[PDB]
Amino acid sequence: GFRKMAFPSGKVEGCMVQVTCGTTTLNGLWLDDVVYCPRHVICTSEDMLNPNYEDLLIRKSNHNFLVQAGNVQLRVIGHSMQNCVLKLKVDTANPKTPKYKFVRIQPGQTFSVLACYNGSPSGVYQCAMRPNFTIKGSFLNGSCGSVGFNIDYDCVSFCYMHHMELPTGVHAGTDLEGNFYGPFVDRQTAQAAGTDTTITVNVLAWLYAAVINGDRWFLNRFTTTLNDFNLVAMKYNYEPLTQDHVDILGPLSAQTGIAVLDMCASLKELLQNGMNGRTILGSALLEDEFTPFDVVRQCSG
Amino acid sequence: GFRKMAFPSGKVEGCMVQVTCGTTTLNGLWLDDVVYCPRHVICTSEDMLNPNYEDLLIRKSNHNFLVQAGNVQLRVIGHSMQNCVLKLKVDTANPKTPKYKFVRIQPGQTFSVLACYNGSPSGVYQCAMRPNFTIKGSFLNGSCGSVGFNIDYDCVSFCYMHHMELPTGVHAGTDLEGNFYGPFVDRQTAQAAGTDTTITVNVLAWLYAAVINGDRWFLNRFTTTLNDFNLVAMKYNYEPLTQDHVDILGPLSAQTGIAVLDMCASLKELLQNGMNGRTILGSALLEDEFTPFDVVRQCS
Ligand SMILES: *[C@H](O)[C@H](C[C@@H]1CCNC1=O)NC(=O)[C@H](CC(C)C)NC(=O)OCC(C)(C)Sc1ccccc1
Ligand SMILES: *[C@H](O)[C@H](C[C@@H]1CCNC1=O)NC(=O)[C@H](CC(C)C)NC(=O)OCC(C)(C)Sc1ccccc1
């Protein structure tokens, strides 16, 4: 009874533009009078094999950047590089700018991606940041500069800007200050995703969701300490819990009356014993890409 | 990778408004100077058990309808009813009205849903019209009047307006002419759907998606005729595959070098032997809510 739901994308659609240098076009994000985009737009395909970004940029001027909203050019009046993002000052404040902030998310957190090509949105879908700092997205050539976001009340929190596709078909990128998630660098040289793990806090959220819906055969009579649970979980390639994880499970723990550590003890028994052919929420697989906020957002509205 | 992907919802967000009658509140769709919404907004709790809608509606006045676009009330200057949809004429045009049309979709087709509450957009996701004319949505109290749609070029094709949830947790609603998909009625009584089936052409498209993304453990060296495949399909409550379906799958067959009927032979083996605890594109079940067009677009 659960599905990945994206946030409504309109507030972000109103911020997408295209940025071109020479023949390289990608997407940018226009907020107030600044356009944010991946810095590799300044690279020729041959530069991308081995770029010196400081030296490539010092040779650029405002008049080398073509920024367009649709087919309408936005004149660039300044430029600077902040980590792996380029910031282009433009002479028009975007009238569709929403209330916004820039946030750096943690593994396990989910967000919506608005996949764009040539400044035009094509589709929206929900992603989770994996513990290895990749996302399992859907991106083609020309998608760089597409962004990921959450919407809280009136306010768009941008958390991801897209830069790269790894050999295993997963994706990597930066926050809006240009800092990559994970060890990746914006160079066209062989790179690989590390070994991934299961997002424990989200599996627990999923078990809480099952309980809310009356599916609770897996609740046991025991508890555990956080440290004992973390040490066991790692033997099953599950992530250890942080204090922040315990706290973000607070609302679901209060809603169900099941202490976080009792649920941990139930999960430990599932890991140690298996499902024994039973299902939870209709599935024999434990889901790890629904956060506690996602569960609340779909169970209680 | 390969994700369930919805259309960007902005063009539809600019059309959602809130409609209240009495203590009943739901969403409407504001296009030009008309607001469309489910007619059961005019019902009280008592009315919903057995509503004579023409009789209930004649007793309403324009001023009984409170329409709000954000923090602005829109004055209703006229109303009519078209099947299960109420059309409220308002004194102001929506400047955010997109290019649009109203279409009635076929079972197996997919669309995006913009789930809304009190006229405010809440989430967007992809659904398919099931063969039994339900949809597996995520809708709560206050979601009625949320709409489903596709976007082609700049044109929004509205295909679904939400009205109800069935005891099994699936959903039912109408096209924008107010006619239900399926044998359902907008009355507060328990209703069951016909036996559902699996959308075979969509399962095949998703198998081809799994191969494009380098996952082909399920393939085999065998083949099958169209009719022999269909005999097995129907036995497992899968929809029949037509020659038009085979034709529609051509691009995906060309892209991958796997003849359609060879992929049919693969699916036959999956149906007869199961997945042996294995997974395809992360799923432990055969997914049937991607169309061939959906797969092609997201891989092109
Ligand atoms: C920007 O639009 C583009 C998005 C990619 C293209 C296809 N799908 C995507 O998500 N980004 C890139 O092409 C990126 C640019 C550099 C970071 C400057 N290159 C890239 O992602 O290459 C990946 C490698 C070379 C780092 S790893 C790899 C992947 C496949 C095969 C071999 C090696
Ligand atoms: C409109 O916002 C509302 C949407 C529903 C609410 C919960 N999820 C939805 O999708 N629509 C209705 O509540 C609808 C109004 C009638 C058409 C007049 N009623 C409705 O959907 O009720 C279904 C039931 C309760 C009659 S079927 C059932 C379900 C569980 C147990 C027993 C019977």
UniProtKB/Swiss-Prot annotation, chain B:
Ranges per topology, Cytoplasmic: 1-300
Domain of life: Viruses
Residue(s) of cross-link: Glycyl lysine isopeptide (Lys-Gly) (interchain with G-Cter in ubiquitin): K4, K89
Protein location: Host cytoplasm; Host Golgi apparatus; Host nucleus
Catalyzed chemical reaction(s): TSAVLQ-|-SGFRK-NH2 and SGVTFQ-|-GKFKK the two peptides corresponding to the two self-cleavage sites of the SARS 3C-like proteinase are the two most reactive peptide substrates. The enzyme exhibits a strong preference for substrates containing Gln at P1 position and Leu at P2 position
Active-site annotation: H40, C144
Peptidase C30 domain span: 1-300
Activity control summary: Inhibited by pyridone-containing alpha-ketoamides compounds 13a and 13b. In turn, alpha-ketoamide 13b (tert-butyl (1-((S)-1-(((S)-4-(benzylamino)-3,4-dioxo-1-((S)-2-oxopyrrolidin-3-yl)butan-2-yl)amino)-3-cyclopropyl-1-oxopropan-2-yl)-2-oxo-1,2-dihydropyridin-3-yl)carbamate) inhibits SARS-CoV-2 replication in human lung cells. Inhibited ex vivo by michael acceptor inhibitor N3. Inhibited ex vivo by compound 11a and 11b.
Reported function: Cleaves the C-terminus of replicase polyprotein at 11 sites. Recognizes substrates containing the core sequence [ILMVF]-Q-|-[SGACN]. Cleaves and inactivates human TRMT1, preventing tRNA guanine(26)-dimethylation of tRNAs. May cleave human NLRP1 in lung epithelial cells, thereby activating the NLRP1 inflammasome pathway. May cleave human GSDMD, triggering alternative GSDME-mediated epithelial cell death upon activation of the NLRP1 inflammasome, which may enhance the release interleukins 1B, 6, 16 and 18. Also able to bind an ADP-ribose-1''-phosphate (ADRP).
Subunit structure: 3CL-PRO exists as monomer and homodimer. Only the homodimer shows catalytic activity. Interacts with host FBXO22; this interaction promotes the proteasomal degradation of nsp5.
Record-given protein name: 3C-like proteinase nsp5
Species, as recorded: Severe acute respiratory syndrome coronavirus 2
Gene: rep
Shown residues within the full chain: 3265 to 3564 of 7096
